[PDB]
């Protein structure tokens, strides 16, 4: 009974940097932050993109996606009501492909944030996603999608 | 021995990089004659004691184990002559069947040795024979107490 009701394989989170928030009627999958940092933090005032996929669990709808703002004044450029038993993909995570060169509704609801606060990759930051059905705190992480490691300066032995 | 040295590969150290404190392997067994030691490590349930500002790690146990093991192996004929009382000059061997108690004791000891040796290989046993590692560990834990008893009973009745 290693394959009983409590089985290791079934209860597994995806091996993705972004967190998964199932709270509310809508499910938030692969929520993360694209924020390349060249120093300890990313200085306040620099725009960082907010990625996630919103999936409407029920066919009966929570397609509003009202504000989803927290400390940082989240802004949803080209906000639209995409979720209808489908997927709302706000941005273009590193590796995300485009079917055609033209983009419907211009940007596909890209979410950007002005930090107003230092942030460094490896931390958890609370982003309150608000929907007409309810609200959820997710603690969005910071993800470096495809950027290779930067060249650390060569060490000088002493 | 020459045929084995040719046709069978023993300790292919080149596959085994130079020792580093950080590098590891999953197998990590010693030769079969210390596999009983390693299995005794694996099966002994993580029992430690903490005196006044001191620690008695679970590893200590195995040392005591070896003591007892050796202390019982080296001294066995004297225990045999103390219990049985045979203090006579014996030159004719005895068929194992003719000594059911000692045959059962030796079968029990061999059973415990085999259980410990295979417990050391519980990692590989689980990998090849699909059994959960925890299941093998607990099979060995219950066995080091049960299997000796069953083997003693069976060997006694078999000798008779």
């Amino acid at each position: 009974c290693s394959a009983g009701q409590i089985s290791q394989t079934t209860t597994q989170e995806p091996a993705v940097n972004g967190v998964n928030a199932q709270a509310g009627q809508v499910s938030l999958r692969n929520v993360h932050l694209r924020a390349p940092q060249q120093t300890d933090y990313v200085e306040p005032g620099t725009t960082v993109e907010l990625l996630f996929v919103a999936a409407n669990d029920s066919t009966e709808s929570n397609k509003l996606k009202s504000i989803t703002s927290d400390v940082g004044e989240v802004t949803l450029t080209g906000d639209s009501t995409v979720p209808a038993d489908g997927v709302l993909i706000v941005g273009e995570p590193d590796g995300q492909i485009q079917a055609v060169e033209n983009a419907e509704a211009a940007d596909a609801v890209t979410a950007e944030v002005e930090l107003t606060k230092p942030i460094t990759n490896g931390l958890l930051y609370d982003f309150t996603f608000t929907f007409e059905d309810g609200e959820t705190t997710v603690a969005v992480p910071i993800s470096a999608g495809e950027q290779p490691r930067r060249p650390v300066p060569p060490a000088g032995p002493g | 021995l020459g045929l084995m040295g040719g046709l069978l590969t023993i300790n292919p150290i080149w596959n085994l990089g130079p020792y580093k404190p950080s590098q590891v392997s999953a197998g990590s067994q010693p030769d079969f004659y210390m596999m009983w030691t390693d299995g005794l490590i694996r099966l002994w349930p993580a029992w430690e004691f903490y005196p006044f500002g001191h620690t008695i790690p679970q590893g200590v146990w195995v040392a005591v184990g070896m003591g007892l093991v050796f202390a019982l192996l080296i001294a066995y004929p004297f225990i045999e002559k103390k219990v049985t009382g045979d203090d006579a000059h014996h030159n004719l061997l005895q068929r194992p069947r003719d000594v059911p108690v000692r045959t059962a004791i030796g079968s029990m000891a061999i059973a415990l040795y085999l259980l410990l040796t295979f417990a050391c290989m519980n990692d590989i046993i689980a990998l090849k024979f699909h059994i959960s590692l925890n299941a093998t560990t607990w099979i060995g834990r219950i066995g080091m107490v049960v299997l000796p008893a069953i083997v003693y009973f069976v060997a006694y009745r078999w000798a008779i």
């Binding site: 597994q12 | 999953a26 699909h130």
Partner: protein
């Protein structure tokens, strides 16, 4: 591609929607979310055949692929479009690069393997046992692309070695070491698996001891 995504969606809608929601969000306690897993994850998981998993147990085992290379690419592209993530390496032609993934250095690849891979797999890439019903499978069967994608995406109880931990150079080096160990003949006679002490002791007690005792019975008498 448009047709590629169409085919991937067709295959997905009738093979895995049960484990993963139609929107690729994992069904609760059946399968995880495929958003952000990437084309590399899909390629490694389906090419090895693991994904039509057909049971929830301690460890999903490898099995014959349920889809062909083109269908593997279709599924991977579908998943890549949905969430966006790691992508399987490819060569100039466009196929899954396998020869090009063999790093030139092997000693450095060997150090990388022993520090990272051997921890659970083996000295020489064989399998290893894990906590409760889990294990690390043998690396002999996996092709260079499969090894690379396995490192690039930690399937289950595998640490996920991002491109930053092991840069494409280090990943190719480790792939080269894995292939070299897997296909290298065991110098010094039949290599009894890769585990030394256990097969070696078993072979002693069978071959050498049975031979010696049989020869003793032949030379000696019975009484």
């Amino acid at each position: 591609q448009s047709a590629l995504l169409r085919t991937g969606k067709q295959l997905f809608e009738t093979s895995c929607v049960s484990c993963h929601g139609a929107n690729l969000q994992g069904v609760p306690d059946r399968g995880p979310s495929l958003i952000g897993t990437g084309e590399a994850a899909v390629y490694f998981q389906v090419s090895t055949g693991r994904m039509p998993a057909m049971r929830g147990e301690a460890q999903a085992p490898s099995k014959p692929p349920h889809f062909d290379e083109s269908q593997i690419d279709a599924l991977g592209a579908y998943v890549q479009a949905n969430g966006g993530g790691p992508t399987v390496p490819r060569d100039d032609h466009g196929a899954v690069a396998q020869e090009s993934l063999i790093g030139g250095d092997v000693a450095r690849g060997g150090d990388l393997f022993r520090l990272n891979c051997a921890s659970c797999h083996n000295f020489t890439g064989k399998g290893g046992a894990l906590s409760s019903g889990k294990y690390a499978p043998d690396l002999g069967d996996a092709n260079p692309a499969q090894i690379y994608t396995a490192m690039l995406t930690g399937p289950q109880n595998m640490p996920k070695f991002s491109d930053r931990q092991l840069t494409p150079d280090e990943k190719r080096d480790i792939v080269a070491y894995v292939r070299e160990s897997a296909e290298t003949p065991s110098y010094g006679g039949y290599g009894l698996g890769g585990f030394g002490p256990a097969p070696e002791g078993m072979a002693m007690w069978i071959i050498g001891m049975v031979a010696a005792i049989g020869v003793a019975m032949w030379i000696g008498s019975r009484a």
